[PDB]
Each structure stands twice: as C-alpha cells, then as structure tokens.
Amino acid sequence: IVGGYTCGANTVPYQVSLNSGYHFCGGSLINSQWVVSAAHCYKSGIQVRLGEDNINVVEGNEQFISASKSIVHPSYNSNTLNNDIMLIKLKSAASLNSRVASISLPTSCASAGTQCLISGWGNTKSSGTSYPDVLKCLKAPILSDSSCKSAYPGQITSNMFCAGYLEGGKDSCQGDSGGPVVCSGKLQGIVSWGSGCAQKNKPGVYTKVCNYVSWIKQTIASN
Numbered sequence: 001i002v003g004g005y006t007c008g009a010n011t012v013p014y015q016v017s018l019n020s021g022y023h024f025c026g027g028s029l030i031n032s033q034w035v036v037s038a039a040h041c042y043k044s045g046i047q048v049r050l051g052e053d054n055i056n057v058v059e060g061n062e063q064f065i066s067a068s069k070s071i072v073h074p075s076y077n078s079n080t081l082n083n084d085i086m087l088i089k090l091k092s093a094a095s096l097n098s099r100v101a102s103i104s105l106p107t108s109c110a111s112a113g114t115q116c117l118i119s120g121w122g123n124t125k126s127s128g129t130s131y132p133d134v135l136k137c138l139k140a141p142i143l144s145d146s147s148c149k150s151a152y153p154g155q156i157t158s159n160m161f162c163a164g165y166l167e168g169g170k171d172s173c174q175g176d177s178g179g180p181v182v183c184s185g186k187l188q189g190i191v192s193w194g195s196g197c198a199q200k201n202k203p204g205v206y207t208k209v210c211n212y213v214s215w216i217k218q219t220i221a222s223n
C-alpha cells in the first residue's frame with residue numbers, strides 16, 4: 001500500500017494472506033470456508049493464512065488452512081484482466097471470532113464519492129521496493145467512471161472501477177493483489193492492476209464485486 005498507515009493487529013479481520021511458501025497475494029474471507037481473491041493470483045497449492053498481522057511472526061491469532069479447490073471466473077481474460085475474480089474453498093471451516101471474521105457481499109454497487117478501506121502486505125514505495133511485515137491500510141474514494149476511463153482510455157470494462165487519487169501518492173501496489181476494497185462495510189472491490197503505483201493520474205483499478213454476486217452465491221451453493 002503506498003501512502004497508507006499500519007492497520008493495527010487484527011482490525012481488518014476478513015483479510016487473508018495467500019501463501020505458497022511466502023505471501024504472494026491477499027484475499028477476503030466471505031464465509032467460514034470460502035475466500036475471494038483475484039484470478040491473476042491463481043496458482044496450485046495455496047495455503048490460506050487467516051488472522052495475520054505480522055506475516056513473518058506467529059503471534060497467536062492465525063489459522064493456516066489449505067485450499068481444497070480454486071475456481072477462476074469462467075470469463076477471466078488474463079490479457080485484458082476483465083473478470084479478475086476467483087473463489088478458493090478451504091479444506092476445513094475456519095473458527096470465526098473477533099479477529100477472524102467474514103465480510104459481507106454487497107447488494108448494490110457503490111457510488112463514486114464513497115470512501116473505502118483498502119489493505120494489504122504489498123510494496124510501500126512507488127519507486128523501488130519495501131515490503132512490510134505488518135498489514136497496511138489506506139482510505140480512498142471511488143472515482144467516477146469518466147475519470148477512470150479518461151485515465152485508462154480503452155482499458156476499463158464494466159467490471160472494473162478506479163479508486164484512489166488523481167494526484168497520486170496513495171495506492172495499492174505489488175503484493176496487494178486479490179485484497180479487499182470495503183466501502184460502508186460491504187466488499188465492493190478486489191485489488192487488480194494499475195499503471196505502476198501512486199502515479200499522478202494513474203489510480204488503482206479494481207474488480208467490481210457487485211457484478212459477480214450471483215456467480216459467487218451459485219458457485220458456493222454447489223461446491
């Protein structure tokens with residue numbers, strides 16, 4: 001997260017770290033057995049790590065559970081990053097408590113102007129690299145579809161939104177992919193792509209979760 005702040009241990013209780021030997025992407029716990037992340041975070045042999053603050057120290061609140069199956073969206077296009085959403089089922093249900101909690105799925109899409117919380121263990125520098133060990137948070141508004149489409153001419157689909165600052169300085173970055181964008185308590189976005197990080201006039205782009213709620217409910221219901 002570039003230009004954000006330290007969340008505080010377990011204050012974002014639905015944040016997961018996806019681990020295949022090291023943290024490679026974030027995700028959101030949406031019920032005790034299912035995680036939603038970005039389809040570009042797909043790989044085999046993912047262990048889901050819940051209740052993390054420092055991803056390098058076992059502090060006591062963690063639950064490390066293997067993925068039993070991954071389902072990438074049926075229309076994910078890695079070239080356009082259109083439909084960048086994937087579901088991960090855990091092998092066993094997690095024990096939910098105040099430090100491990102699921103986030104609600106939206107019933108409506110959120111408006112431009114809505115302030116959101118974005119979180120992750122990704123790069124904190126816009127030039128060069130420094131990966132944090134503890135979770136970082138950022139508050140950023142949803143941008144209008146006009147601003148988003150003029151920042152990225154020809155790249156924004158109806159399943160994408162921009163959230164951030166046109167002045168730059170604050171943004172998600174490498175290592176934040178798959179993580180939550182939560183606005184008014186509902187999961188509204190997934191960290192997906194952008195032109196670098198915290199670049200002027202180049203805000204982050206996010207998968208628009210409200211478009212996928214029937215696919216998410218149907219897949220959970222049958223798997």
Ligand SMILES: *[B@]([O])(O[C])[C]([C][C][C][C][N+])[N]C(=O)[C]([N]C(=O)[C]([C])[N]C(=O)OC([C])([C])[C])[C]([C])[C]
Pocket residue numbers: 024025040081122171172173174175176177178191192193194195196197198203204205
């Ligand atoms: B993610 O992979 O973290 C593990 C990361 C989050 C980036 C957040 C940006 N606000 N996502 C990516 O790296 C994705 N790629 C890009 O965002 C690339 C670098 N952007 C890009 O090439 O920009 C253009 C030149 C305009 C197309 C990919 C999906 C891994």
Ligand SMILES: [Ca+2]
Pocket residue numbers: 052053054055056057058059060062
């Ligand atoms: Ca830890």
